Every structure is written in structure tokens, then in C-alpha cells.
Design a protein around this ligand. Structure first.
Ligand code: 99T
Lengths: 198, 204
């Protein structure tokens, strides 16, 4: 079968796992436990990475999601053409950017020695997250609710990661519509099954 | 019109500019200059891309696309020549994976630039810097070992992305040697650097 190089904490892996659940493809993929190397190091250790039967490996998560969305016969979760394609992919990119910034803040606080922390840098990354959440609340609520697709899955996983690694960034208070949407989609079997450990 | 947030230093912007040049679409896209960093944001950019990153592409109706991969995907469908991103089949995912390899080199290279140029020297995290150096080297080794013929076969999304990553290494990290251990990649890069699209999009 397909082998997915996997880690249960990664929000980028989670996107893939949620799509697999949602599209009924989970039983087609074997999860290979894979080691994180955030400080210093599937020869490139890409996570997620998807190995096909010829030994060739696909990455990163966006490429893997694109591939997997074409292997099932249900409604596509990534629009194949038209304005909706780039709108949903931009919303997904917005979510990926929330993840990128969240991961940078996490790696700094969890892995860099305190003496080497840079507050202006950390605040700059926090600001990206705040600005992105504001856009979602102001512009994207109806859009997210319309279809649990590439955009909704990516945002959901970004929000899950914020709760997981950054509980002290309270985001529900200033984004109540996003909070209500998230509470609901959090109960989907795909989301329940893919929560990060501890 | 279309408006692209732009500077000549960014290799992600460069991928877009190279595609525009290769596909004959430059005269459709206005450039809006952006100077920015995570500690010095562009407030005009932030109103369009809340992540505060370039490229971002404002469409005629004011809808904004980002990040670079989304913009490349859109622009590749706005010309009637051979696509630079395969739209069907195994080739799509191989070429996009190679592009992702290149984007990984760029991502690491940019984080290293910000560490060395912006963060105070006494706060430089040597062990992480070493890690990033190694991650870049391993990616280059994979290109050298596995992808040379593939890159030379078509100057497409994969070739453009790799080329922009190499240009960025030379630009921001000239003291990081990459040619010595990757001669086939170096030779390919020397050849495609002579393409008009590459010559026209060099960093300052
Ligand atoms: N995923 C995005 C990444 C884009 C990206 O990181 N762009 C960089 C400039 S590269 C040039 C840095 C330099 O001056 O050397 C950028 O906008 N940095 C601003 C910031 O992170 O605040 C994409 O693919 O478009």
C-alpha cells in the first residue's frame, strides 16, 4: 500500500489524516512512525511524506493532499478548476501560514535556550497569527462552513494546533464565529481521531 | 489589472517573475514594491495578505491570492502555451515534489538569513544553524543524485523552483559552498542561468 511517513503531533500531517478519513481512504495507507528533527537532522526526512509503490516519495503536505484528492470518487475537496480553486487554496495557504508561524513560536519557546529568545521576532510571528484569525472571522466564516474541504480542513488543523501548543493565546474571545464553527467541526469523526497527543 | 507585491530579493517572488517571463505574461502584471521582514512589516501588504509575506497577487476584482504556489498555479492557466505545471498524471506529482524540495531549501535559507542578518549575534543558535545547513545540503545531494536529467528535460515548475533556490543561496549565503559537491547541478544551473527569464530576474 501507500506508506505515509507520519507523526501524530504535526498539524501538517493532520491535514493529510483528516482528508484520508473524510474521503474514506484511511485503509489504503500504512502509517510509518517517523522521527522529528527540529533542531538538526525518505532520505530528507520529510513529514508528512507519501511513498508510492515504485519507491517514489511525494511531499510536502500540499502535494500529498492534491494527490490523495484524486484517488477517491467522492466530491473533490480541492476544486479542480475555476475561481473556487484559487479561493479555497488561498484559504488553505492562510491556514498553512498560521501553522508556520505557530510552529516557529513553538520551536523557539520549546527548543531554543531562553537567553537566545528574541521578543520582537516572537511578537512578529504572533502578529501573523492574530491578523490571519481576524481575516477568517471577518471574511471567511460562511466559506469555511460551506464545504469541509481543503480550506476548512487546513484551518481546522491550524486551530487545533493553536489549542495544543499555544493555549495562552486565547483566540475564541475575539473570533466567536470561528469558535462556534470549530466547536462543531471538532466533533467530526475525522477530527476526533486525529487530535495531537497529550 | 493584476498587481503583484514584489521585491527583487525574494526567491518566491522570483519564481512568479520567471514564470511570467517564460509564458509571455509580464505586461499583464503591475508590480507593487514591498520591503518587509517579520520585525518590519509592510502595512499595505498586510491588508491583502494577513501573513505579511510576498508574493501576493491582487486580481482585477480585488481578491488576493497567496502563497507563491497558489499564484503560480493560477498564472499557469492564464496563458495558452505548454503548461509549466502538469495538470494531470504522475508527472504532476513528481514535478510538484521536486518544486517542494526546492521550496524547502528556500524556506530554510530564508530562516537562516533572518537569524544571521536580523537576530542579535549573541542570540544566534549555532546548533539549529548547523541543522539547517545540513538540511539544505541533503536536499542538494538528492537533486544531484536523482533529478538532474529530470530538471534539464523541461524548464517548468520544478526547474524554475530549483533555479530560484540556487540563485538565493548565491545571493544571501555566498559563503555556503554548494557547487563543489554537486557538479551536475552546478553545470545545469550555469546553463539555465543564461535563459532570458533568469537574467531578467536576478537579485540586486
Ligand atoms: N510560503 C511563502 C513564503 C514567502 C516568503 O517567505 N517571503 C519572504 C521574502 S523572501 C526574501 C527574504 C530576503 O530578503 O532575503 C517574506 O515575505 N518574508 C516576510 C516575513 O516573513 O515577515 C511563499 O511560498 O510565497
Amino acid at each position: 500500500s501507500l506508506t505515509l511517513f507520519h507523526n501524530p503531533a504535526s498539524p501538517y500531517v493532520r491535514k493529510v489524516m483528516v482528508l484520508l478519513h473524510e474521503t474514506g481512504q484511511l485503509n489504503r495507507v500504512a502509517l510509518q512512525a517517523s522521527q522529528l528533527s527540529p533542531v538538526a537532522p525518505n532520505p530528507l526526512g520529510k513529514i508528512p511524506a507519501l511513498r508510492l509503490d515504485n519507491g517514489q516519495v511525494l511531499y510536502d503536505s500540499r502535494v500529498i493532499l492534491d494527490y490523495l484528492d484524486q484517488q477517491h470518487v467522492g466530491n473533490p475537496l480541492i476544486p479542480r478548476d475555476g475561481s473556487a480553486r484559487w479561493r479555497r487554496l488561498t484559504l488553505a495557504a492562510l491556514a498553512d501560514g498560521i501553522m508556520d508561524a505557530s510552529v516557529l513560536v513553538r520551536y523557539e519557546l520549546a527548543l531554543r535556550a531562553p537567553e537566545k529568545h528574541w521578543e520582537q521576532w516572537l511578537d512578529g510571528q504572533r502578529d501573523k497569527i492574530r491578523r490571519a484569525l481576524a481575516v477568517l472571522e471577518a471574511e471567511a466564516i460562511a466559506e469555511l462552513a460551506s464545504h469541509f474541504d481543503i480550506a476548512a480542513i487546513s484551518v481546522a488543523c491550524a486551530l487545533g494546533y493553536l489549542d495544543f501548543r499555544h493555549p495562552d493565546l486565547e483566540w475564541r474571545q475575539d473570533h466567536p464565529q470561528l469558535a462556534a464553527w470549530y466547536f462543531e467541526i471538532s466533533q467530526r469523526p475525522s477530527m476526533l481521531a486525529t487530535r495531537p497527543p497529550v
